[PDB]
Design a protein around this motif. Structure first.
Motif, PDB file in Angstrom:
ATOM      1  N   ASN A  22       0.820  -1.212   0.000  1.00  0.00           N
ATOM      2  CA  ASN A  22       0.000   0.000   0.000  1.00  0.00           C
ATOM      3  C   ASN A  22       0.856   1.265   0.000  1.00  0.00           C
ATOM      4  O   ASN A  22       0.698   2.144   0.846  1.00  0.00           O
ATOM      5  CB  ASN A  22      -0.942  -0.018   1.196  1.00  0.00           C
ATOM      6  N   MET A  23       1.772   1.369  -0.965  1.00  0.00           N
ATOM      7  CA  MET A  23       2.652   2.532  -1.022  1.00  0.00           C
ATOM      8  C   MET A  23       1.871   3.817  -1.270  1.00  0.00           C
ATOM      9  O   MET A  23       2.232   4.874  -0.738  1.00  0.00           O
ATOM     10  CB  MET A  23       3.712   2.334  -2.103  1.00  0.00           C
ATOM     11  N   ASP A  24       0.807   3.748  -2.071  1.00  0.00           N
ATOM     12  CA  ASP A  24      -0.017   4.922  -2.331  1.00  0.00           C
ATOM     13  C   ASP A  24      -0.551   5.520  -1.035  1.00  0.00           C
ATOM     14  O   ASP A  24      -0.466   6.731  -0.809  1.00  0.00           O
ATOM     15  CB  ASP A  24      -1.166   4.552  -3.272  1.00  0.00           C
ATOM     16  N   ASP A  25      -1.100   4.675  -0.159  1.00  0.00           N
ATOM     17  CA  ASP A  25      -1.726   5.188   1.056  1.00  0.00           C
ATOM     18  C   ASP A  25      -0.700   5.669   2.075  1.00  0.00           C
ATOM     19  O   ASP A  25      -0.922   6.690   2.734  1.00  0.00           O
ATOM     20  CB  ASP A  25      -2.632   4.124   1.668  1.00  0.00           C
ATOM     21  N   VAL A  26       0.418   4.954   2.227  1.00  0.00           N
ATOM     22  CA  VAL A  26       1.446   5.415   3.156  1.00  0.00           C
ATOM     23  C   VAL A  26       2.049   6.726   2.667  1.00  0.00           C
ATOM     24  O   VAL A  26       2.436   7.584   3.468  1.00  0.00           O
ATOM     25  CB  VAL A  26       2.516   4.327   3.374  1.00  0.00           C
TER      26      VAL A  26
END
Lengths: 39, 39
Positions: B19-23
């Motif tokens: 979940n790189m987008d959310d972090v």
């Protein structure tokens, strides 16, 4: 400085390259003074 | 898929996160059907 792309990598991975913004935007498409010196 | 933010990490760094987008969005401010079964 570290900002907005170096930050995520430095916080989760553990490294942060200086020209990170350049690497990113390439990978995905995207006052002189006068001083008396002696020459 | 690793797209547009996992790419830099997986290429220069060598790591990746799901979940790189959310972090990223947080660290900085920023089909049904019907079958026959036996219940």
């Amino acid at each position: 400085v570290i900002a907005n792309t170096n930050l995520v990598t430095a916080l989760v991975m553990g490294k942060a390259v200086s020209n990170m913004d350049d690497v990113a935007r390439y990978l995905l498409g995207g006052g002189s003074a006068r001083v008396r010196a002696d020459l």
